[PDB]
Amino acid sequence: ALSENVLFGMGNPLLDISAVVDKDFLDKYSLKPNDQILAEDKHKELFDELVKKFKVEYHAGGSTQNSMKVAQWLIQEPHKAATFFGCIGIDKFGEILKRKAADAHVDAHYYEQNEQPTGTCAACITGGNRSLVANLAAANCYKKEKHLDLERNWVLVEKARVYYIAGFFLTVSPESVLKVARYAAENNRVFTLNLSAPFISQFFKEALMDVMPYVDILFGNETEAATFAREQGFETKDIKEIAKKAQALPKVNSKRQRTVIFTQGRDDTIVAAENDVTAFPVLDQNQEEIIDTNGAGDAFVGGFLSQLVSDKPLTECIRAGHYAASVIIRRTGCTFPEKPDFH
Numbered sequence: 001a002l003s004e005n006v007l008f009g010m011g012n013p014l015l016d017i018s019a020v021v022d023k024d025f026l027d028k029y030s031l032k033p034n035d036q037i038l039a040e041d042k043h044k045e046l047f048d049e050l051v052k053k054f055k056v057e058y059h060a061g062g063s064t065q066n067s068m069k070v071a072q073w074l075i076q077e078p079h080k081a082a083t084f085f086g087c088i089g090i091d092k093f094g095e096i097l098k099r100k101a102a103d104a105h106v107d108a109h110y111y112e113q114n115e116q117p118t119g120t121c122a123a124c125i126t127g128g129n130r131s132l133v134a135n136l137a138a139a140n141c142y143k144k145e146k147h148l149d150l151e152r153n154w155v156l157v158e159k160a161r162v163y164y165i166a167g168f169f170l171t172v173s174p175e176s177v178l179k180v181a182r183y184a185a186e187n188n189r190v191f192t193l194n195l196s197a198p199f200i201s202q203f204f205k206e207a208l209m210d211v212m213p214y215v216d217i218l219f220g221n222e223t224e225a226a227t228f229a230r231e232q233g234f235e236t237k238d239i240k241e242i243a244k245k246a247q248a249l250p251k252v253n254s255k256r257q258r259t260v261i262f263t264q265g266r267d268d269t270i271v272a273a274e275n276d277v278t279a280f281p282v283l284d285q286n287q288e289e290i291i292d293t294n295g296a297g298d299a300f301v302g303g304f305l306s307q308l309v310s311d312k313p314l315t316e317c318i319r320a321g322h323y324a325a326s327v328i329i330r331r332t333g334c335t336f337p338e339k340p341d342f343h
């Protein structure tokens with residue numbers, strides 16, 4: 001039986017707010033029916049209006065937290081197998097988010113501050129369409145020295161066997177990422193990281209390459225891989241070759257070989273390990289049943305991690321990732337039914 005806090009994540013928590021809205025609402029906030037955006041000045045009151053005017057459903061969100069809740073869902077027992085750290089506000093949304101994280105059986109410990117509201121992501125649904133508006137807000141305000149470094153929180157890091165941090169968090173607290181990564185190397189534990197988005201490899205390459213030697217498992221997708229390769233001078237556009245070259249990057253913990261895992265949408269998931277590159281087909285090809293790809297990557301990682309914590313074989317970790325993604329992409333955002341049916 002797994003211990004509590006066996007899986008640790010940290011990143012940018014967001015309160016997901018989903019609702020069926022109307023034309024007037026979309027028009028007021030200048031939203032096309034399938035826009036996916038970061039909030040601009042015109043959207044700062046959107047979340048308050050959304051909750052006042054419409055019946056909403058709330059979820060614990062943000063990329064890393066999504067992966068934690070999916071992992072927890074598939075782990076099932078114990079509750080609080082997955083830990084999550086990040087920054088929230090001292091507001092009603094922050095209280096709702098704490099409740100949702102608890103409902104998801106994740107052991108969330110948030111840094112709370114008063115300067116910024118809790119981050120939010122609105123899914124504004126009309127018919128089969130949905131408009132996404134994300135406001136990072138408090139998520140950008142995480143303070144290593146006021147949260148991670150406190151013993152009551154650091155000990156939860158020390159409880160983990162496996163760590164996962166989205167590369168998005170390199171834009172907020174790269175020193176937190178480095179400290180966790182260093183601990184993983186010092187203790188021969190598995191540290192995992194997502195490339196997260198092309199802009200991470202372009203604009204945050206210093207932090208990314210500072211952490212890379214500590215990465216036991218690098219997750220990403222084909223678009224991130226292409227950008228990473230260009231920025232690192234790999235001189236190839238072939239995804240398998242990119243994965244092989246990333247696998248062979250400098251590494252401090254030589255007790256564990258790096259694994260590089262790049263998803264390709266409906267095309268094969270590519271896995272580079274020490275002595276080979278293997279392609280894992282995506283067996284779910286019913287494209288017409290896909291209603292929303294938002295969170296597919298987060299769910300893939302969560303499914304993978306759910307099996308990794310039990311030292312299951314690579315094939316099983318990939319199978320669980322593909323399963324989780326297949327569930328999430330048939331629902332608005334990174335959500336799932338009460339119980340998993342992964343066998």
Ligand SMILES: Nc1ncnc2c1ncn2[C@@H]1O[C@H](CO)[C@@H](O)[C@H]1O
Nearest residue numbers: 263265266282284296297300322325
């Ligand atoms: N178009 C698609 N068809 C089927 N599965 C998909 C698609 N896009 C994403 N996925 C699933 O989500 C994962 C992450 O993108 C993929 O590896 C796959 O498992």
Ligand SMILES: [Cl-]
Nearest residue numbers: 011012063064
């Ligand atoms: Cl994140």
